[PDB]
Design a protein around this ligand. Structure first.
Ligand SMILES: Cc1cc2nc3c(=O)[nH]c(=O)nc-3n(C[C@H](O)[C@H](O)[C@H](O)COP(=O)(O)O)c2cc1C
Ligand SMILES: C[As](C)(=O)[O-]
Ligand SMILES: [Zn+2]
Ligand SMILES: [Zn+2]
Ligand SMILES: [Zn+2]
Length: 118
């Protein structure tokens, strides 16, 4: 499955490169015409980044699941971008991981996406 992602300081980008799955960085101009999983980071106080919000305003039809990178210092706001997107668009939260993730976070994401893709 295609992974769409956004990264501001490189942590989600690093995670993407550990997955070895088809992936595309989201942009203002991007239209995704096939099923995809979104990986986002969390910004502000528990929020979805603006670039991800504007992309999802336009591309949510094919969204099948969302993961968030985040930081457990944020307590109940940890990965809350994924909670928001999941609730709004009624798609599963695939996973939450800290920063660029661990090897287990990588395998877990892949195994959960293989499930959702069936
Ligand atoms: C200003 C700021 C606010 C943040 N807010 C949250 C947050 O609410 N929840 C969370 O889990 N992580 C939060 N984070 C942690 C980032 O999501 C985390 O560093 C993420 O790995 C950044 O991804 P990126 O390097 O791909 O941009 C915040 C980080 C910054 C700098
Ligand atoms: C988003 As890419 C072209 O570094 O896999
Ligand atoms: Zn690359
Ligand atoms: Zn806007
Ligand atoms: Zn707008």
């Amino acid at each position: 499955m295609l992974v769409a992602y956004d990264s501001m300081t490189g942590n989600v980008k690093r995670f993407i490169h550990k997955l070895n799955m088809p992936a595309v960085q989201i942009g203002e101009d991007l239209v995704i015409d096939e099923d995809f999983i979104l990986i986002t980071y969390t910004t502000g106080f528990g929020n979805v980044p603006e670039r991800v919000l504007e992309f999802l305003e336009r591309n949510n039809e094919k969204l099948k699941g969302v993961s968030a990178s985040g930081n457990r210092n944020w307590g109940d706001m940890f990965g809350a971008s994924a909670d928001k997107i999941s609730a709004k668009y009624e798609v599963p939260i695939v996973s939450k991981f800290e920063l660029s993730g661990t090897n287990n976070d990588v395998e877990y994401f892949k195994e959960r996406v293989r499930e959702i893709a069936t």
